Amino acid sequence: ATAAEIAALPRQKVELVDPPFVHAHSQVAEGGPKVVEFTMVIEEKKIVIDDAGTEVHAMAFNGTVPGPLMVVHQDDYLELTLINPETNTLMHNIDFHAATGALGGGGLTEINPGEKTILRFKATKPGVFVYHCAPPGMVPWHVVSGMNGAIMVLPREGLHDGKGKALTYDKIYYVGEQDFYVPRDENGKYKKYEAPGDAYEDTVKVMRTLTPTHVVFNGAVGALTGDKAMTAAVGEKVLIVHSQANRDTRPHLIGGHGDYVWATGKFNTPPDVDQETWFIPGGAAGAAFYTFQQPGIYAYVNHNLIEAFELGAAAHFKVTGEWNDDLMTSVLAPSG
Amino acid sequence: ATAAEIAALPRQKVELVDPPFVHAHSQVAEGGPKVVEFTMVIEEKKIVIDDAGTEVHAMAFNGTVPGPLMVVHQDDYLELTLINPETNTLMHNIDFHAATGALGGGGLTEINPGEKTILRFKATKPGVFVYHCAPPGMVPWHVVSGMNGAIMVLPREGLHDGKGKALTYDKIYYVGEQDFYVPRDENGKYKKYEAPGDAYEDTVKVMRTLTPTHVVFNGAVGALTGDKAMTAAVGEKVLIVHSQANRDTRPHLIGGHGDYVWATGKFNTPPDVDQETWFIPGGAAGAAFYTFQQPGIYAYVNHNLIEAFELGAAAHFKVTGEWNDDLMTSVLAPSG
Amino acid sequence: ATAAEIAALPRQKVELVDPPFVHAHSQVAEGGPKVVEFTMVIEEKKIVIDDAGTEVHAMAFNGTVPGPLMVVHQDDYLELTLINPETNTLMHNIDFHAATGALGGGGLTEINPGEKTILRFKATKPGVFVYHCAPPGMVPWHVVSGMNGAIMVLPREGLHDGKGKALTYDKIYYVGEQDFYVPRDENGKYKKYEAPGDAYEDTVKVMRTLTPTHVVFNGAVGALTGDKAMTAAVGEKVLIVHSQANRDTRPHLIGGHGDYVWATGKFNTPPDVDQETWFIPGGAAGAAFYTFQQPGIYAYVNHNLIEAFELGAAAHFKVTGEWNDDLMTSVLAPSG
Ligand SMILES: O=N[O-]
Ligand SMILES: O=N[O-]
Ligand SMILES: O=N[O-]
Ligand SMILES: [Cu+2]
Ligand SMILES: [Cu+2]
Ligand SMILES: [Cu+2]
Ligand SMILES: [Cu+2]
Ligand SMILES: [Cu+2]
Ligand SMILES: [Cu+2]
């Protein structure tokens, strides 16, 4: 409430980690409200999104696309120190959909290269929320250049299902889905540029068609496959947080389900259950809780299979454990 | 139920107002069921939809894009007098998604220029509902030319949250979102036509691309911005009714939330809460309730930011009142 | 659990029927769990999808687009004998979104032309689910070639509303919606190919536009109209199961509503009510229950009206019975 009361609150410095991993945290809040501090440096950098060497001039929070997931509990204060190095060429800011006021913080955080700012907001509503840059007049360009992420505001008492039973996860992963619009020369080959501003004009043109050239998880085709496939074990309870700051998505765990899905991403809105495919509108984050029952590889995809398999929206899960023949079994293997 | 009963009902004429404003009404029903009378005249006229002077041959109920919001209470009868002036060149009708029978009323209301008709229907289900023109054979064309609106059928006892607690708004706004498909010549310049019919062929080709050239609120880019921005004050409860008769939208109040959102637009379906971004499918209306907590300018947009900032789907809210530093504060303003 | 306990379970072979019809079944379970057997033969065949004679080298389960609806009860075992004829040229498999393990069964059912296989899985979650072919590396191509359908796992106690009140339908229809991507020549005319292979490259290009040339019900424009229109009567309770394995859809019954809609298709997730237009994300099936109140023709459509009336997503209902003037009446017929 009063400035004095907040000043008396305990503070905690949090160390952020690159997605799909999430920084250390407790599901059930340990203590009364606290002022949780985070710091992120913005990095304008070239990223290679496919095996054809296609480049995107990314604008990354903390150096990754998407930016890192920040975890706090309801009614804590999130205090972010955002830094825009002199090495950058553009003005940047940040809008937290979890925050109330000044365009989510964007109106208070406009920093040119060489500046920094510290914003504090009370995480009044529990749920997963998108955050992204939004420089007046250059909003979609920064967002589709990968300048977005999400935060999770856990209820103090952790997650619960619709009937109040607790839902405690064993593992948590953050999948940030991105729609990229890469210009092509007259031959159909993606163009490369020597600077962000150089690509601007060409990129806006592709954007207006509303047809992405690539739709990827964690910044590139295959990011979350192979050496980067997510893992779990049969019997493990996993929470998958998924965000899309500009375009709709329809997550689906091939071989599994969304046991409980907070499709709107808001914990006070009861989760849907036994989901095959859920929907997350552009501009929101959602969360799915599932207990693995079968070992093997799974594919986590945006279920418009063209986007998943032609455009790049596909990730994998490698699960260990014993096969359950009651759930599924090959009565007759493929034969003549 | 019986003949005598329906005939005995009080009749009440209501004067409509142009969106985003809504005609005078009471949230909780005043008295018993009545036959609520409305009259709308159809206007076919050229309108400028952007800052470049792009013209469109609009087809509008009451002359506005979207058509006005009609408000009744559950179990009232809505009796509409629809007039199609002889000066018009096309046949028109109306489909009330709130109505039951004859294609929503479209089958009983086909009027050529020079004709009028009166349709009555019992508003049996509570919620916000889309209404639109639907001449057989050219349904899409009339709808994407601006011929659609919405009605609100309030529960006789007003709005309530998930657990029976009353939700009373101080104001209500109706934002109608329109996807336009304007043809361009070989040079990329939008084309102008003499009569509506002349644009038909070229328009359908653009429509089939499923990519609108414009996505606007209240009929034009910036229609709900600047001096035409909607208003509120800290502590004020606002209901925003939003509709899209042909294409999906994902509404978001930048700097705010949808405290209670009947995303499906139906009041018997519990509203979602603490929403960051909600989803309204094409062919439906939705409603969001919010109590403002911070003063300043807000942007209400379709969260596909390319559609919001490149195509036109962005409106403003100007809110007066005191800033709340507990909710948000700039600890360190942008500095070196 | 053990193969012995499942083998001791009663077995029942079912004869599938072509959509939109559904094979015989009981809403409330007939005794205890059983192994329900189904068989489907895959056929690669050319089909005509519109009145201009446009053809598609379809890949169809049971020779139909969509494949037929399999109906079982929660905790029953679905045992499918899938056959891929010598006459076929491609390998096919099946992924049941209702199943748990091996990519929905897809990794255990890869059969080359001249092969067959038998997969059994426990239908552990109640709801309607999509099933589709998914040959690694050629997933979207098989799906958008028509190789998908849906199954319904009814609660053992039949359907119930969100409050436990029983919901028994008189009729049921299965509407499979298909997005087709047909290449066109320099004259804008759809192309025809000798072998499905010759079409691959051109089709992939169209697929990458994320813009289908046709969006149809039961494999063709107008397939569920005329003498093929669905039927009902005033007072009749009808359940419509709708699926879209690759792309979003927003169903709407013109002139009616979705009284209870399991928009996510999962029966343990309470249905929305009084729906005007609902939403089914690509990769999912949904179900809507409605009691007809008015006689006449109804159009059941995907509510992006361009997809419905330009692309092919519109079906009809012919309803017999008496007109209800209380619900709707033409006070004044179109006149001067
Ligand atoms: O289950 N994925 O197509
Ligand atoms: O929440 N506005 O991009
Ligand atoms: O109500 N469907 O156009
Ligand atoms: Cu930025
Ligand atoms: Cu935003
Ligand atoms: Cu009209
Ligand atoms: Cu409609
Ligand atoms: Cu196949
Ligand atoms: Cu699938």
XYZ file of C-alpha atoms in Angstrom, chain C residues 51-292:
242
model
C -19.011 -28.559 -59.203
C -16.298 -27.460 -61.625
C -14.886 -30.971 -61.260
C -11.745 -30.083 -59.294
C -10.015 -33.294 -58.304
C -7.788 -34.244 -55.424
C -5.693 -37.385 -55.010
C -7.188 -38.125 -51.625
C -5.868 -40.470 -48.965
C -8.904 -41.796 -47.127
C -9.555 -44.040 -44.125
C -12.399 -46.369 -45.132
C -12.452 -44.560 -48.477
C -14.154 -41.480 -47.008
C -13.172 -37.874 -46.289
C -13.445 -37.585 -43.390
C -12.849 -41.093 -42.148
C -15.750 -42.581 -40.146
C -16.521 -41.911 -36.495
C -15.657 -44.756 -34.108
C -17.749 -44.720 -30.914
C -16.702 -46.462 -27.655
C -17.130 -45.736 -23.949
C -14.605 -44.543 -21.375
C -12.378 -47.398 -20.251
C -13.248 -49.605 -23.217
C -10.375 -50.767 -25.432
C -10.477 -49.677 -29.064
C -8.863 -52.340 -31.265
C -8.353 -51.211 -34.837
C -7.233 -53.442 -37.672
C -5.746 -50.976 -40.162
C -5.079 -52.220 -43.698
C -2.954 -50.582 -46.427
C -3.831 -52.362 -49.796
C -1.255 -53.511 -52.359
C -2.889 -51.042 -54.720
C -1.605 -48.092 -52.661
C 1.731 -46.379 -53.269
C 2.434 -44.850 -49.819
C 3.047 -45.971 -46.281
C 0.399 -44.779 -43.824
C -0.143 -45.003 -40.051
C -2.670 -43.631 -37.537
C -2.456 -41.214 -34.595
C -5.450 -41.338 -32.263
C -5.530 -38.122 -30.212
C -7.608 -40.134 -27.710
C -4.747 -42.593 -27.097
C -1.692 -42.508 -24.791
C 1.735 -43.573 -26.116
C 3.812 -43.986 -29.263
C 2.741 -40.720 -30.915
C -0.947 -41.656 -30.521
C -0.314 -45.053 -32.052
C 1.449 -43.571 -35.044
C 4.794 -45.111 -34.244
C 3.281 -48.599 -33.875
C 1.171 -48.595 -37.017
C 3.475 -47.720 -39.899
C 2.313 -50.037 -42.696
C 3.503 -50.118 -46.270
C 1.226 -50.961 -49.204
C 0.355 -54.632 -48.767
C 0.573 -54.523 -44.986
C -1.787 -54.427 -42.065
C -1.539 -53.977 -38.324
C -3.757 -54.125 -35.234
C -3.467 -51.455 -32.532
C -5.300 -51.501 -29.223
C -5.485 -48.641 -26.724
C -7.500 -47.816 -23.615
C -9.940 -44.928 -24.174
C -9.111 -43.391 -20.838
C -10.476 -39.880 -21.399
C -14.072 -39.038 -22.414
C -14.721 -36.702 -25.375
C -14.536 -36.477 -29.172
C -10.992 -36.715 -30.537
C -9.373 -36.361 -33.931
C -7.438 -39.286 -35.510
C -5.174 -38.826 -38.509
C -2.328 -40.302 -40.522
C 1.164 -39.031 -39.658
C 3.977 -40.574 -41.744
C 7.194 -39.024 -40.415
C 8.345 -36.318 -42.820
C 5.025 -36.213 -44.709
C 2.569 -35.446 -41.899
C 0.682 -32.384 -43.140
C 0.503 -33.675 -46.719
C -1.363 -36.833 -45.664
C -3.657 -34.898 -43.333
C -4.597 -32.211 -45.886
C -5.142 -34.983 -48.461
C -8.079 -36.094 -46.358
C -6.484 -38.651 -44.127
C -8.198 -37.827 -40.855
C -11.423 -38.449 -38.922
C -12.690 -38.493 -35.315
C -13.725 -40.898 -32.531
C -16.083 -40.371 -29.623
C -15.390 -41.836 -26.210
C -18.697 -41.453 -24.377
C -18.779 -41.335 -20.584
C -20.000 -44.745 -19.369
C -23.020 -42.890 -18.013
C -23.831 -41.046 -21.239
C -23.602 -37.277 -21.632
C -24.549 -34.834 -18.837
C -24.523 -31.052 -18.596
C -22.136 -29.048 -16.450
C -24.412 -29.674 -13.439
C -24.756 -33.440 -13.817
C -28.234 -33.283 -15.426
C -28.402 -36.010 -18.117
C -28.232 -35.053 -21.791
C -29.612 -37.656 -24.221
C -29.631 -36.898 -27.966
C -32.177 -38.301 -30.428
C -29.794 -38.134 -33.419
C -26.100 -37.551 -34.006
C -24.122 -36.379 -37.032
C -20.366 -36.180 -37.607
C -19.209 -33.224 -39.703
C -15.577 -33.552 -40.798
C -14.171 -30.269 -42.117
C -11.299 -30.382 -44.594
C -8.913 -27.728 -45.819
C -7.619 -28.486 -49.324
C -4.695 -26.784 -51.062
C -5.214 -27.132 -54.810
C -2.587 -25.732 -57.268
C -3.754 -23.539 -60.159
C -2.427 -22.901 -63.632
C -1.474 -19.485 -65.098
C -5.179 -19.086 -66.010
C -6.267 -19.561 -62.395
C -7.797 -22.964 -63.175
C -7.212 -25.875 -60.801
C -4.591 -28.391 -61.949
C -5.092 -32.152 -62.390
C -2.374 -34.762 -61.980
C -1.880 -38.345 -63.174
C -0.241 -39.615 -60.006
C -0.539 -38.056 -56.528
C 3.238 -37.755 -56.603
C 3.209 -35.266 -59.521
C 1.087 -32.996 -57.318
C 3.288 -32.932 -54.186
C 5.640 -30.006 -54.964
C 2.918 -27.703 -56.276
C 0.647 -28.548 -53.331
C 3.356 -27.847 -50.720
C 3.814 -24.353 -52.191
C 0.081 -23.707 -51.776
C 0.165 -25.209 -48.280
C 2.897 -22.755 -47.261
C 0.540 -19.856 -48.016
C -1.572 -21.138 -45.091
C -4.513 -20.302 -47.365
C -6.695 -23.263 -48.436
C -8.341 -23.151 -51.851
C -11.325 -25.139 -50.483
C -12.701 -25.683 -46.966
C -15.407 -28.324 -47.139
C -17.695 -30.599 -45.159
C -17.727 -34.366 -45.912
C -15.127 -33.997 -48.670
C -16.825 -31.614 -51.111
C -18.480 -28.256 -51.598
C -22.204 -28.839 -51.004
C -21.716 -32.427 -49.870
C -24.225 -31.956 -47.032
C -26.911 -30.067 -48.964
C -29.845 -30.867 -51.248
C -30.912 -34.459 -50.788
C -27.756 -34.973 -48.717
C -28.835 -32.345 -46.191
C -28.966 -33.378 -42.534
C -32.455 -33.626 -41.046
C -34.272 -33.165 -37.745
C -37.680 -32.220 -36.390
C -39.013 -29.563 -34.045
C -38.368 -30.872 -30.548
C -35.583 -33.194 -31.624
C -32.287 -33.239 -29.671
C -29.343 -33.438 -32.029
C -25.641 -33.816 -31.269
C -23.220 -32.620 -33.946
C -19.579 -33.741 -33.657
C -17.268 -31.495 -35.735
C -13.562 -32.001 -36.395
C -10.744 -30.166 -38.152
C -7.413 -32.004 -37.997
C -5.232 -29.163 -39.364
C -6.945 -25.788 -39.196
C -9.237 -23.744 -36.987
C -12.972 -23.602 -37.468
C -15.809 -21.638 -35.847
C -19.129 -23.563 -36.225
C -22.496 -21.794 -36.318
C -26.017 -23.114 -36.917
C -27.765 -20.250 -38.798
C -31.153 -19.805 -37.169
C -30.234 -21.916 -34.143
C -27.605 -22.119 -31.393
C -25.400 -24.608 -29.616
C -27.432 -25.151 -26.443
C -24.527 -27.020 -24.787
C -21.187 -26.956 -26.541
C -18.096 -28.920 -25.539
C -16.011 -26.544 -27.640
C -12.784 -28.319 -26.592
C -14.528 -31.658 -27.252
C -13.767 -33.025 -23.796
C -16.686 -34.189 -21.687
C -14.953 -33.671 -18.356
C -14.686 -29.965 -19.289
C -18.163 -28.376 -18.623
C -19.929 -27.263 -21.773
C -20.472 -23.654 -22.675
C -24.151 -22.806 -23.167
C -26.373 -20.709 -25.447
C -23.578 -20.439 -28.004
C -24.060 -18.453 -31.182
C -20.717 -19.406 -32.694
C -18.110 -21.679 -31.046
C -14.444 -22.382 -31.774
C -12.573 -25.643 -32.531
C -8.811 -25.291 -32.952
C -7.032 -27.147 -35.734
C -6.042 -30.544 -34.427
C -9.249 -31.016 -32.431
C -12.893 -32.161 -32.467
C -15.797 -30.431 -30.721
C -19.429 -31.365 -30.011
C -22.629 -29.305 -29.808
C -26.061 -30.325 -28.500
C -29.209 -28.500 -29.696
C -32.969 -29.017 -29.454
C -34.661 -27.707 -32.632
